């Protein structure tokens, strides 16, 4: 008689566990779909006298952060408008590096490529015109 | 039961009932902040999620128009 | 007995999930195909006395917008016919920059290159004759 | 009952592995963006009496090295200012070849083309005026 | 009573097997990452009188071997510095083909392209100047 | 006792199914490799008086067919040597269009570009000299 009791107990436990796994899979779907996709929608302007990056970013996911910046050699901090809203927006970020100060002064008018290290593990490649 | 756009989850207010077969549904979404946020994405692609009553989430791709 | 129940539950869940993924992939196809492709089909005219750009644009995709303009140094707003219908059309856009006013007055008759920053993340390179 | 346990074990392992791969891909992005781009921004001067190359180089990436030089026939070593900082800078490199000594003495005033072999796998083509 | 005994036996077997599979997957990751990446970081020199290839190779993976060479028509053996250490290094490889002897003697000064067949399944394309 | 029976039944069924899938994948490999690659290996001659295309085609795959032709405006049928053997061969195809008759008569000596729509879904771009 114990055999059928064990059979039912195991059947119901397996059903509960399978439903848990399926719910987890669909939660993973919904979470990865809306994780946050940040890209560039136009050229940036890198003021070399003040070292200020004005960039237009498009974010069609969750509201992420800007944790770091990667310029030619050094990775520097950021000190302005770190919060990336959703949609398309123009952000004005003040970059802080030790050595790059006055290094760009000899590049006014030329193009440059930066990287933005976001909080959600994504890195964004940015193109900019160096100005003064 | 619900919709999931870039940041926020919002209610739906139309044709919530999914009949069987293939059908074209016109769902009115309601979020507080996303109002006028998509106005700068006209023409671009976007990805949404639909939270159904049977525990299944459906991933949808959409073109943003105006 | 529970093993086969679990097996069928997982099989059906996997079928549902795979169908969801395939539908999403084909939706992505159809969405990226008709996202909006804007190009130039003839030289533009940049009136320097009024700073007005008359340009013929071809758009074989979705109806986009014109968010910004990029002239030699500055990025400026636009204040006319920002909506790009489908097909080939002649648009008359009034550009607004602070300093470029009366700067092109010494370029009448010469060629120039502008950029149009569209709402769908695309930038269009435009060539124009500067007139007055 | 074991089926669903195995299913969740594999699901979580797959999520971990996929996240690892995605992080690696974005790291590759960030690394290749700032790998180091060196070009020339003005004519060089090749002193043929002392065989010294004075060249103005622009480097908008990581700080690379100058490992070799390639003049008409021979590849020779360099013995000065091997380190290329970031930005635009004027470098005075002392080249050393066995045979080219006194060979350029018959080219004073004419043009010549060199190659620079950098540490980051990139070769830079340089143009120079031979002087004395 | 046997049902639950079988259930636990199968559960522990499944956990052991899944852990084996996951460990094997991560080992595959670590192994394919450091398998050996060999490329060229500067033009090679192909001495046509002695038929000797002086080439600068960059290898950022495991220490591979040079098993064969592929010149214009024929694949030939190699007889020197077959072992590719890690890093950037200058290798002097003596090639041996029966027919190509004295064939390059009419190509001095021109450019040529060779292939190196490595031990780790990778073929490396090399560009060289033919000298004498 | 039923649990282990179920486990082995599912194990053998899964092994059979996995082997079926792997066999199908390798069949897909072998089938896509030898599908038929048709290209041009020399200029074609388009006789405008008789409207006859003499073209040398190279096909290193399966023996495909020529289902249609695409000339400047119209898509026309073919009425000769529709079968493409393997190897390099010179084919003489009689094209049939309603309007193009006597239209090429004003292009004798000039170059033109055609398209061949093959049976295997591949289109081949051809260049031809218009003759008479």
Residue numbers in the entry:
A (entry chain K), C (entry chain E), D (entry chain C), E (entry chain I), F (entry chain G): 1 to 132
B (entry chain S): 67 to 132
Kindly provide excerpts from the paper associated with this entry:
We present in this paper the structure of two additional archaeal T4P, one from Pyrobaculum arsenaticum, a neutrophilic hyperthermophile (optimal growth at 90 °C, pH 7) and the other from Saccharolobus solfataricus, an acidophilic hyperthermophile (optimal growth at 75–80 °C, pH 2-3). Although the full spectrum of functions played by archaeal T4P is yet to be uncovered, they are known to mediate adhesion to various biotic and abiotic surfaces, and play an important role in DNA exchange, intercellular communication and biofilm formation. We show that whereas the N-terminal domain is conserved in all bacterial and archaeal T4P-like filaments, the C-terminal domain of bacterial T4P is unrelated to the immunoglobulin (Ig)-like domain shared by archaeal T4P and archaeal flagella.
The S. solfataricus pilus was very similar to that of S. islandicus, albeit at considerably higher resolution (3.4 versus 4.1 Å), which was not surprising given the ~81% sequence identity between the two. While multiple helical symmetries appeared to be possible based upon analysis of power spectra from these filaments, in each case only one helical symmetry led to a reconstruction with clearly interpretable secondary structure. This was a rise of ~5.3 Å and a rotation of ~101.7° for the P. arsenaticum filaments and a rise of ~5.0 Å and a rotation of ~104.6° for the S. solfataricus filaments. The small difference in helical twist between the two resulted in 7-start long-pitch helices that were left-handed for P. arsenaticum and right-handed for S. solfataricus. In the S. solfataricus pilin, similar to S. islandicus, only about 1.5% of the residues are charged. In S. solfataricus, we see clear extra density consistent with glycosylation on seven residues, all serines or threonines. Whereas binding of SSRV1 to S. solfataricus pili is likely to be mediated through carbohydrate moieties, direct interaction with the pilin subunits might play an important role in the case of PFV2.
